[PDB]
Amino acid sequence: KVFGRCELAAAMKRHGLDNYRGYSLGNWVCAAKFESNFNTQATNRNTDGSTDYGILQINSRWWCNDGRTPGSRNLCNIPCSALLSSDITASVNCAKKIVSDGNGMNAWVAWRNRCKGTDVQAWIRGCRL
Ligand SMILES: [Cl-]
Ligand SMILES: [Cl-]
Ligand SMILES: [Cl-]
Ligand SMILES: [Cl-]
Ligand SMILES: [Cl-]
């Protein structure tokens, strides 16, 4: 499923990401844009052989099991495929574990390089929320 920008924002808010750990809703929408283009079926390979899955490109190195990432953990205790559903529950709950881990949203390299320090509020401009 490919989300509309305001559609994604609404689901993220309902799922409680709005100022979760102090990160305003715009941050999460910005991250999702550049990680996955709001496409829940997005998958990308990393240099270490792990894979990123879902609207928020959660990686198999630490957070989900895909059975093909040697020397990896599954800290959110989910199959990585579960993250590609049109329902973003599993991704959001996992992201909540991740962002509470210590580096906050810097865990998402795209957020760090492309959203951090920008006006992320622009990403929920005009949305009914
Ligand atoms: Cl957009
Ligand atoms: Cl709807
Ligand atoms: Cl584990
Ligand atoms: Cl990570
Ligand atoms: Cl980047």
Quick one: which of 5, 23, 30 has its CA closest to 110?
A: 30
Long-range interactions of 64-70: CB distance < 8 A, separation 24+: 64/94
Domains assigned to the chain: 1-129 (1.10.530.10)
Ligand 1 centroid distance, CA of 34 (Å): 10
101 labelled as ligand-binding?
Answer: yes
Catalytic residue among 35, 48, 87, 119: 35
Closest-lying ligand to the alpha carbon of 7? 2
Q: Say if CB 82 and CB 67 are below 8 A apart.
A: no
Annotated catalytic residue, options 7, 18, 52, 119: 52
Establish whether 52 is a catalytic residue: yes
Residue 75 φ then ψ, to 5°? -70, -30
Cα–Cα distance for residue pair 15/88, rounded to 1 Å: 9
Alpha helices in 15-88 (DSSP H): 25-36
Q: Which helix (H) or strand (E) holds 51?
A: strand 51-53
Enter the resolution in angstroms. 2.0
7 noted as active-site residue: no
